[PDB]
Design a protein around this ligand. Sequence first.
Ligand SMILES: Nc1ncnc2c1ncn2[C@@H]1O[C@H](COP(=O)(O)OP(=O)(O)OP(=O)(O)O)[C@@H](O)[C@H]1O
Ligand SMILES: N[C@@H](CCC(=O)N[C@@H](CS)C(=O)NCC(=O)O)C(=O)O
Ligand SMILES: N[C@@H](CCC(=O)N[C@@H](CS)C(=O)NCC(=O)O)C(=O)O
Ligand SMILES: CC/C=C/C[C@H]1C(=O)CC[C@@H]1CC(=O)O
Ligand SMILES: CC(C)C[C@H](N)C(=O)O
Lengths: 569, 214, 214
Amino acid sequence: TFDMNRVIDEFDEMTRNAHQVQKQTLKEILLKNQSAIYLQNCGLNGNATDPEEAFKSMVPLVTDVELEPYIKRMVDGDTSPILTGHPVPAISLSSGTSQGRPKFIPFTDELMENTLQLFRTAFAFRNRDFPIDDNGKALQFIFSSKQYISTGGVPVGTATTNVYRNPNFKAGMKSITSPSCSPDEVIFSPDVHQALYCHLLSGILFRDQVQYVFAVFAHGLVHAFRTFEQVWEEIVTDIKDGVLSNRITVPSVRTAMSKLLTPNPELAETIRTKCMSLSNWYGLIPALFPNAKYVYGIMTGSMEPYVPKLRHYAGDLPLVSHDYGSSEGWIAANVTPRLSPEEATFAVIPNLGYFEFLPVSETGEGEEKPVGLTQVKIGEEYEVVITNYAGLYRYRLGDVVKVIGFYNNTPQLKFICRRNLILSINIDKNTERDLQLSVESAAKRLSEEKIEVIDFSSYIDVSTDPGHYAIFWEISGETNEDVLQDCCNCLDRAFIDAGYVSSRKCKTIGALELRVVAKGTFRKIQEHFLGLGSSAGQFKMPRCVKPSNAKVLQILCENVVSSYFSTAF
Amino acid sequence: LPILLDYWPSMFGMRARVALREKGVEFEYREEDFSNKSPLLLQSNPIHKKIPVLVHNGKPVCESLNVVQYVDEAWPEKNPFFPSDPYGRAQARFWADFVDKKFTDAQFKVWGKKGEEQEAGKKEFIEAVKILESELGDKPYFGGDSFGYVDISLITFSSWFQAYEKFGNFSIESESPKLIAWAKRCMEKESVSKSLPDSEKIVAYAAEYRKNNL
Amino acid sequence: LPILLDYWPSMFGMRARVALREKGVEFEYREEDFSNKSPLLLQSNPIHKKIPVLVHNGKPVCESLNVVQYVDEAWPEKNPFFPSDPYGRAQARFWADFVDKKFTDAQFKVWGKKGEEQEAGKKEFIEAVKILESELGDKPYFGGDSFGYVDISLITFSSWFQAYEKFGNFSIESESPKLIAWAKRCMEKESVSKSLPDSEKIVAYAAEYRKNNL
Ligand SMILES: Nc1ncnc2c1ncn2[C@@H]1O[C@H](COP(=O)(O)OP(=O)(O)OP(=O)(O)O)[C@@H](O)[C@H]1O
Ligand SMILES: N[C@@H](CCC(=O)N[C@@H](CS)C(=O)NCC(=O)O)C(=O)O
Ligand SMILES: N[C@@H](CCC(=O)N[C@@H](CS)C(=O)NCC(=O)O)C(=O)O
Ligand SMILES: CC/C=C/C[C@H]1C(=O)CC[C@@H]1CC(=O)O
Ligand SMILES: CC(C)C[C@H](N)C(=O)O
């Protein structure tokens, strides 16, 4: 039961018992998770009166290459469990790569508890600073429109997808948020760009009731508001007649909107005047919802360049920076959210995992051994090492943090940029360039429609006979199939290398499938990643999916607006 | 500075622009109101009054394929569209003449006319794209080992492919895919990726044409 | 030896002959029966089966101006049909196609029709005759300072001039002394003196054609 005062005091206690809970989290994670096979590798049995020291002495550091094969055996037909407690309910990916190729991280229900308690706490502090009407609504550019099942019959899911479709999502979130304006069907629509379009429409639906405008990411926000500049007259024509634009095709979404559509010529008059009055769309968000206390999301590092344009759209409204952590592990929440993006910091929550930090101090890399979270030196920068319920134990995400200060007994951390980069040779290539050739080459036939490809990915399906590349697109708008079928042919025709020639012609691995998905998919991925919270480097998206890769994978198949197997050959 | 007399949906005007931009010329485009055919145009071809017209040394150069070999011969040092042999030249010319006859009239039939006229044109164009697909065989292009003469000739028809797909209510791709397939291949050339206007508008002009003459 | 698959009454057969003979090349002429086409002809001309087709070194060349251009390009060592300049060539190709379409369409209206279309064709052919006259002036040829590429394309119609005066009931000599006299100069050369069949034969055929087909 969400109460501002008890949760904050409790969190305060938690912050001041930060050292205790970190410890207790380590003992409890290991008890809960004692039987993991790498633990036999180190020699652990659990408990006793020397548990914490023994854990650090016995358990060595791990890279993506060491973790990828193991939990690879977890997902694909071997439903066999590997490193925390049971077999996993979901499956993940990490930005940047494991030697140029897919990385994976496990998912548990506890991460859902982590989410629900974290948002409870974060909402409270922010609601303390920005008090809301509990009878209002809010504009959330948020999706979980897609769930597919892996080759072994095990769900493989993004952070968006496993929260929002989680059986406990609705009841746990109802008490700590303003109800999303759009129906669950739109959020989970097979056609998200149009559903985002109806999401714009949706927050637009309950404007006065809207307390805040929420997207995980500021680039998400700029995307939406630039798109606004694009489509404001079409929306006004659509909503006015009581008939949505014929652009919109998927039936479930069509039914929901049809439940909401009847002719009203009146407001069209109001909108053409208001939208025409704007200056280069300055202060777009206050214009739309004059009374939103804040625009909410991560405003630092990679998203810092998009925040001013969003500021341009948000006017003089404050951009409130969101918390810092993920299914890989939650570290911090913003407990002074009124702080500006330039001065924004995040205070670590210590019950979600046992975290450690590798010193960079010396020159390069540093080769110093790690100290405790509260043992960190103020002012200096460290790489976060992760032990938790996410299947990573003393794991190097590969990421640099700064200690701005202590919020009571917990550290405040600050982050600049997006790049956690050392890279290797992939085997999902078809080098980044050639694959990029494939997207760009197929994209011009989308271009004749005045559309550019905003992003893209690919997957190797070894379930089928013959296996097949699946190419995925995030694009600006809806169009017809004939061109997208043409598309897929070009992606086949763009993969320059000969290897592709023998098989695809010989069909030993099958026809490439162009599964066309809608807006924000790759955004949700970036949302996931800079929101990973261990990190300053999280913005690099894996281009082609090995069996291992799973973030892009979750959002991939059902959200396919249209999917095609080449009618070529 | 080469002065071109063009028409936003001229597939032939596009043959010119694609040819010139493929070569390496900076040139100027002037859009025509064929209701009011220009003083300089009416002096370029006072009888056809037809474009594309590239103007060089103050000498009007006319007709689309004429203009593109004009493109070859005007800057003969960098990007040749033909190969070295005379026979290969004759083959590419052969096939540009192909592009220009049953192919153009058939598309003209599929977006320009209807009914008894329509299906004649529809099988004609599918027959066309099939002999076409057969001679493409394997080649990245057509008129040589690289971007070619007739590459320029028939690439510019692939923004009307959308028009054909819709009025014909067809899909020229399950019957002959490697062609359209080759087309969005040839779109990556900066010569056609900036010379050719959008297909939704081209589709709409076919729609304006149709709505006018029913 | 070069292989010519041809039809003796066809003007376009004759341009293959004029270009080949103008050069000095020795070739074998094969008279084709449209009712019973040669094996070589189906293989040489699968798509349109139209004469003449020249087989050289086992590669086929088809259509009218193209065979002439191939002939000029295949044997560039002696007498060149085109000008060295791109632009002059430009003019030639323009004028050659000019003779092949509009002059030729009105041309088919001359020997191949009756009634008001005949009247139309007659208006059209004398006028384009006048503009052929316009481009000319007081000179022997067309394509070059000697016998040229456009001369090649148009001189073959001179065998058919007797039919056009005949069926046209018009005075090409009186209105256009220049074109006919241009025809008789070209006739002075063995290239036309031995490639153009007796006009009596084609002139008889055309009438026989008229009688036979409605
Ligand atoms: N940063 C975050 N943003 C959103 N949800 C998160 C986040 N971190 C943890 N979660 C919870 O984790 C839940 C599911 O993410 P989940 O672990 O299933 O994805 P995964 O692919 O299996 O792992 P990962 O998200 O780390 O790549 C998510 O549904 C969400 O509720
Ligand atoms: N086949 C011709 C195409 C010529 C043609 O069809 N021209 C049309 C434009 S597509 C035209 O100019 N019409 C003149 C007018 O309508 O004013 C060529 O070789 O280019
Ligand atoms: N495309 C050929 C045209 C040749 C031609 O018209 N030949 C005549 C033979 S008299 C013909 O095709 N008649 C049509 C037929 O027999 O169906 C060329 O350029 O030479
Ligand atoms: C806790 C519930 C949702 C997860 C948090 C996410 C948002 O909803 C906004 C940014 C943030 C990204 C991140 O911290 O993972
Ligand atoms: C709101 C969150 C579910 C977004 C999340 N960071 C993701 O895209 O995975």
